[PDB]
Amino acid sequence: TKVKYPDGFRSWYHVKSMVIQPGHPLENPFGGIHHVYANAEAIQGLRGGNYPDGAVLVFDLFDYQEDNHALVEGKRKLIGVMERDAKRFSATGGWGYEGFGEGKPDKRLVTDGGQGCFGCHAAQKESQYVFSRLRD
Amino acid sequence: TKVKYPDGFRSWYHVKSMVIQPGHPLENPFGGIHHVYANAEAIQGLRGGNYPDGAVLVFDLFDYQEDNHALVEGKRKLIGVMERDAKRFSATGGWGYEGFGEGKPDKRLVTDGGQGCFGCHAAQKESQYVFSRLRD
Ligand code: HEC
Ligand code: HEC
Ligand SMILES: [Zn+2]
Ligand SMILES: [Zn+2]
């Protein structure tokens, strides 16, 4: 019913990264450097299989500072989490969506059952609602 | 005494990332988005422990493209590798240095036994020649 905080996500597989700079549509609140991490079961789905129950993807979002044309990671702003469970999260296409302020377990950001997250991720219906792709 | 290509490095622990843009003093040759990875032995060293022989750090460098206020990962330009062996790599501080063009095992880049890489990393004598720091 509630998405579990993904303890230990930092030791998971790093899928990819991207920088969202001021002026981008997603600036509020997804601006900054973000890294995507996937647990073992999520890798399964990324590689072409079905996503099994228990698959977790994390969007790890850092602020950054521009210093002499380098962008340097600052503080973590939040994580976004998608947890796969076809039964429990059926209202939102089988993924549960949560945000944790500053990456802390006690700071839950979503107040609408995850419908707002779901509304945009629904555009990737064809890829099981996941935008990120494996790269080497 | 060649550095081994670090097979499977992409499933290692992601330490940190940084973006180096035009203007920054290191644009040539390290411009792009880079990610740092570490195997289990290197984490022992990064944690404040000592570095076991067999510790490997990888600098994975990507070109990026500007897309509407986002920087998006493009193609891999190269990986830099530091491989810990106090006796084998005595001449450059106990770390062997190698570059692989586009991350390819066949594209070895280093021609001078690693002297040029070591000359800059030698600035970090007091952290055992490693610039990166663990973060959360
Ligand atoms: C469009 C308006 C979005 C809304 C609202 C949300 N997300 Fe999102 N998300 C979006 C894109 C374009 C991406 C890909 C970023 C990239 O580097 O390519 C993402 C990514 C995620 C991920 C990583 C997995 C993936 O689908 O690629 C997670 C775990 C994720 N998003 C979670 C999430 C949550 C919990 C949201 C509401 C708080 C949410 N997203 C909103 C686009 C959009
Ligand atoms: C200064 C002119 C440099 C030269 C020449 C080389 N490297 Fe380097 N390296 C440099 C910095 C400032 C950093 C840290 C980047 C960051 O995000 O903090 C690095 C990092 C590495 C790493 C990751 C481990 C670490 O020390 O932080 C590796 C594996 C590494 N560098 C390898 C490497 C090799 C193989 C080189 C010659 C081909 C080389 N470096 C040159 C600065 C400089
Ligand atoms: Zn604009
Ligand atoms: Zn700039």
Author numbering:
A (entry chain B), B (entry chain A): 1 to 136
Could you give the paper's own sentences about this structure?
A widely applicable approach is the use of photocaged substrates, where the photocage is soaked into the crystal in advance and then activated using a laser pulse to provide uniform initiation of the reaction throughout the crystal. This work characterizes photocage release of nitric oxide and binding of this ligand to two heme protein systems, cytochrome c′-β and dye-decolourizing peroxidase B using a fixed target sample delivery system. In this work, we describe a thorough characterization of the application of the NO photocage N,N′-bis-(carb­oxy­methyl)-N,N′-di­nitroso-1,4-phenyl­enedi­amine (henceforth referred to as NO cage) to room-temperature microcrystals of two proteins: a gas binding cytochrome c′ (McCP-β) and a dye-decolourizing peroxidase B (DtpB). Laser parameters for photoactivation are systematically explored, and time-resolved structures over timescales ranging from 100 µs to 1.4 s using synchrotron and XFEL beamlines are described. We have demonstrated a sample and time efficient approach using fixed targets to carry out time-resolved SSX and SFX experiments with an NO photocage over the microsecond to second time regimes.
An initial high power laser experiment delivering 1600 µJ (580 nJ µm−2) of laser energy to the sample over 10 ms of 50 kHz PORTO laser pulses showed NO binding with an occupancy of 1.0 (1.80 Å resolution) but with notably different 2Fo − Fc and omit density features to those from subsequent data collections. This high laser power requirement was due, at least in part, to an initial sub-optimal experimental setup where the fixed targets were orientated with the narrow end of the funnel-like apertures facing the laser beam, and with Mylar sealing both sides. In this orientation, the chip acts as an aperture, blocking a significant fraction of laser light resulting in inefficient excitation and causing only part of the crystal volume seen by X-rays to be illuminated by the laser. The unexpected electron density features may therefore be due to laser induced damage (though a loss in diffracting power was not observed) or non-uniform excitation.
